[PDB]
Amino acid sequence: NNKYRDVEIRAPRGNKLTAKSWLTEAPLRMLMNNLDPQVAENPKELVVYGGIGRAARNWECYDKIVETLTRLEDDETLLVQSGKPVGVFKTHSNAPRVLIANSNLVPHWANWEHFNELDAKGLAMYGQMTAGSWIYIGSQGIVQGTYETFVEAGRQHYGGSLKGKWVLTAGLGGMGGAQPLAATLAGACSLNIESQQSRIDFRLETRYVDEQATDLDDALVRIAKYTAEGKAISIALHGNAAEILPELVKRGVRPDMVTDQTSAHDPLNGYLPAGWTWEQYRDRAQTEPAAVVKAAKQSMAVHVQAMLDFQKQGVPTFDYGNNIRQMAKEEGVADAFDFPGFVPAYIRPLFCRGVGPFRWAALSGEAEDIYKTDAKVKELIPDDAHLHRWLDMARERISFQGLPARICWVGLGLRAKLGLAFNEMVRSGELSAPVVIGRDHLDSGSVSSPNAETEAMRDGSDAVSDWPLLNALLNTAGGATWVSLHHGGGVGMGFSQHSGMVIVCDGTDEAAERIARVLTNDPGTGVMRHADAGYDIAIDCAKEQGLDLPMITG
Amino acid sequence: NKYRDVEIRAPRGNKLTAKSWLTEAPLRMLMNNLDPQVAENPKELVVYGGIGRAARNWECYDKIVETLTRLEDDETLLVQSGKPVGVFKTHSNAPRVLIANSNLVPHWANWEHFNELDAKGLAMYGQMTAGSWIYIGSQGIVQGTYETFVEAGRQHYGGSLKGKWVLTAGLGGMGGAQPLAATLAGACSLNIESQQSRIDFRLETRYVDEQATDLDDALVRIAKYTAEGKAISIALHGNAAEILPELVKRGVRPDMVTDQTSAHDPLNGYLPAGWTWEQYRDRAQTEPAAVVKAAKQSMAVHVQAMLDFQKQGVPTFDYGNNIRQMAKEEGVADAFDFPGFVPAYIRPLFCRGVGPFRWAALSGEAEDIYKTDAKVKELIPDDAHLHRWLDMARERISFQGLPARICWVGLGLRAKLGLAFNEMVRSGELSAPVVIGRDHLDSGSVSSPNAETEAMRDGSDAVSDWPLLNALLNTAGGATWVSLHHGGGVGMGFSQHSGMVIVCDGTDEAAERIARVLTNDPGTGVMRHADAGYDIAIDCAKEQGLDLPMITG
Ligand SMILES: NC(=O)c1ccc[n+]([C@@H]2O[C@H](COP(=O)([O-])OP(=O)(O)OC[C@H]3O[C@@H](n4cnc5c(N)ncnc54)[C@H](O)[C@@H]3O)[C@@H](O)[C@H]2O)c1
Ligand SMILES: NC(=O)c1ccc[n+]([C@@H]2O[C@H](COP(=O)([O-])OP(=O)(O)OC[C@H]3O[C@@H](n4cnc5c(N)ncnc54)[C@H](O)[C@@H]3O)[C@@H](O)[C@H]2O)c1
Ligand SMILES: O=C(O)/C=C/c1c[nH]cn1
Ligand SMILES: O=C(O)/C=C/c1c[nH]cn1
């Protein structure tokens, strides 16, 4: 192993290569970017986000991945198995250069206890979604999704804009840290409970949260003031959600929306029991992990009961993909699922058109490369004012972390248009170096997760996981530059299966042929999957886009 | 939509109905999987292994055939639990079909949830080769069953098994290979089977030799034949959960004990003690939970008899039908006191990438397989065990559907063979293309802690990254169709595994694909066993020049 190394890693910048080609330089740079101190939550331990989501299994494996990517030939493919470079095989230049499979366990053994047994033997690594597949871009990766969720909740419950309203939530980790800024962009104030001061500080440093209250009473004074003024200000409060949310219910405080984004998906590592310190928690997880898991899950039950109590008061309440309802249910809160997941409640119609967390990064390191792509997106999508406003807010309010990157939700049809245009900007020298195009594994065709993205599918097919497997096979066949299959991202061991893809735009004609089919097929599989489930909006999209769906179009 | 009173057989000869041999091949192998001489119950789409099906339902079957017929050379069909769900543009060196069957998010990966989805029209059990169109009747498993009995004989009895007998049960599609495998290894065998129609199928296909009239008759025949050193297989109509405890009580001592009933699926594949098959199938529809319970309670009695034979010193092993797990769930706490066949006997073969490599003649002509048998002997001139295998196959294995051959070979020889076969197609020595495939039971394509990855030396039994990487790499290298299945062999919850088939159509493009795919597919198994730290696998990797960064640098 070892899993601690006191080094600062950053992606190399500019146009000169360390690896043999841009197709192998790209995953090299994106692996290193996943560990950049401005990007990752705890990169000296290889941790990117999401509990113990890691970029490589241990530091020996990291070193060997870098060494191997550096020498990999253009007709060779590296296999990464739970963060370990296990084999290099001959393929061809239009296949992926890296195939990644992280954290997959045969289902009867797919649980944290067995994962932790394997980890102790040096046999495991949790990939999360984008940690082990090298496409994490800091809090920006999720911020548009969290904004779209808050906007749609506002449209359903409050007439759209959240001006004068406030969101109550918890968790200011890598992904959770997007919540305050997303709320602000949606027009709302927010109170964001976080148990570690260093995480509040990271969100302040990256300008994802605005201020820190001195205590709960002071936080409520600020929320009362800013909402009365119609300001949209995010407030962090250092504390424990499982103590504060029940206290807020006892006080009859009524937020306008309630959710949670603590790392409840991993009770041993990601969720602080009430009354404990993070330091006690980390230490006791090593001596008495069973007792720590039970204490964490008991506090999750208290926390979810508070969420249910807000909901009974008429407050819009939803689960944001961290499996907390499941944990509470296992601890006796039999009605934990009385509030819905964010996807069936708010986001699923976007997935039905293949819209999701499409993203790209400038391997050059140059901010202006992303600003030039933003301008190109506006030229190619001239009549979508919501999207133009998103890109304006991103430019004005999202500061880059590590390599400049952009989140921009778009769906089937436009993803390929954008990717081909970016490839041509690389060819012409408008862009100073190639760019990579990817996405979260949360996307319309790439995830099965019955307590998150596939909760409450109208046909009952929540648990069917053929679809992400087919998505990864098809990305490999079409020519993505690296393809990944992961288990347990988001919701934890046992609860999801999902796929990732990244494709490099290096300005070549060969890349253009791959891009045209890969960025059609990847969102196409999500429209297909939702059309199969019988969503009329997905069937309409399939017809509009000319998809060939034999059981539907013949 | 579930039942169709039709006989289906693969098209023969050289005329295509699809646009190329790469799309004609999956069309013919899908049909071959349903041939009445191949499949256990093809009018309900069932190929083998409980309810392992070739397509979800008959509408889906028809649409797969229609879609394969029109598929272009740069298009790929996606099959999702036996349903043709999308056609997408790829390129001519990608697979024409990508298949994912029966995959369920792990917390829901169980038969109860499968059956809920099935009742909604949302599910199909792919087994291993049922849903991925490379089943060749009982021949697909017979050499692995033979290699298991041979290695058990080497470990326990000095090799040959002449004078010895095996006790087992299950004469279904794959269990039907057990009698002939025992015979070829030199042993007599007693094979318990609950359905006379299954005994008849094995008799007609020459996989079992005789049927005893009752248990006493069976034992008189075993005593006589073993005393004479004959290797004869005996079927007995009955219930193993009744007969095995009776043999323990009688003090009968077989020389090996195993089982291959469909214990992996209590609702459909395992008859409770005292029930008729009709009663079981009727009640399965009326009271499924009570049927599951009764089946599992009988599996517990069955497994306790196996444990009781082992206590008497009888070599006893689990042959991958998950029966130990079912018995443990019913209270047999020491059900895993006897091992699975792979850690006990077969794993050293997997460490060299050796496994159930196979091919089929799309022409339909037996002589095409005889020509390939002769070519294998020429290419592998100094392996007399393999030559004897092919001689025994010729003599004793009858073809079922398209003529096909099982021939266990590993890393290095698979590619030599497939390139030679492709050259035979190109020269016209073979009268039509051949398909080359394998079971999903193979060194790099399955994670199954109660079967192929039981008791890995490093404790990595449940790691299922490996079959997913195998499928991704076969897709990258250009197999003709690639599959990812869940629950083959051992049932929902207990395995994940990959399949591949590649067509040898005589062309230079196929040759390029074949050379890397038939290197990489067994290469991933040698890699996986090398990663676990098996010195035999590390040696193989070095011999074969594999690039394993954490071992070779
Ligand atoms: N459905 C989705 O789309 C989706 C998307 C992204 C992330 N996720 C999930 O979101 C969750 C957060 O991800 P992340 O990257 O921010 O994780 P992280 O591990 O980086 O951060 C979790 C934060 O929760 C805080 N925390 C834990 N227990 C607390 C408690 N009791 N009170 C207050 N704070 C507490 C921790 O101090 C930490 O800062 C994870 O469960 C992740 O898997 C789900
Ligand atoms: N370990 C391996 O390498 C391996 C390989 C292949 C298949 N399998 C498993 O082998 C098993 C058999 O496969 P198959 O294709 O023969 O299945 P099948 O469903 O075609 O046949 C099962 C047979 O078991 C018989 N049977 C059921 N209960 C019985 C009982 N109590 N007494 C006697 N007979 C009984 C049935 O009548 C049937 O003929 C399945 O569990 C399959 O998944 C394991
Ligand atoms: O946007 C990202 O990079 C990460 C997201 C993710 C989704 N679910 C768990 N992690
Ligand atoms: O040899 C075959 O075609 C099928 C086999 C298989 C292995 N395990 C479950 N099915």
Curated annotation (Swiss-Prot), chain A:
Keywords (A to Z) from UniProt: Cytoplasm, Histidine metabolism, Lyase, NAD
Protein localization: Cytoplasm
Gene3D superfamilies with a match to the protein in the record: Urocanase like domains (3.40.50.10730), Urocanase superfamily (3.40.1770.10)
Named cofactor requirement(s): NAD(+)
Effect of C408A: Loss of activity
Database matches in InterPro entries: Urocanase (IPR055351), Urocanase-like (IPR023637), Urocanase_C (IPR035401), Urocanase_central_sf (IPR038364), Urocanase_CS (IPR023636), Urocanase_N (IPR035400), Urocanase_Rossmann-like (IPR035085), Urocanase_sf (IPR036190)
Chain sites annotated for binding NAD(+): 50-51, 128, 174-176, 194-199, 240-241, 261-265, 271-272, 320-321, 452-453, 490
Enzyme Commission number(s) of this protein: 4.2.1.49
Pathway participation: Amino-acid degradation; L-histidine degradation into L-glutamate; N-formimidoyl-L-glutamate from L-histidine: step 2/3
Cofactor binding remark: Binds 1 NAD(+) per subunit.
Protein's UniProt keywords contain Nucleus: no
Enzyme class (EC, first level): lyase
Catalytic activity, as annotated: 4-imidazolone-5-propanoate = trans-urocanate + H2O
The protein's role, per its UniProt record: Catalyzes the conversion of urocanate to 4-imidazolone-5-propionate.
Family membership: Belongs to the urocanase family.
HAMAP family: HutU (MF_00577)
The protein's name in its UniProt record: Urocanate hydratase
Organism this protein belongs to: Pseudomonas putida
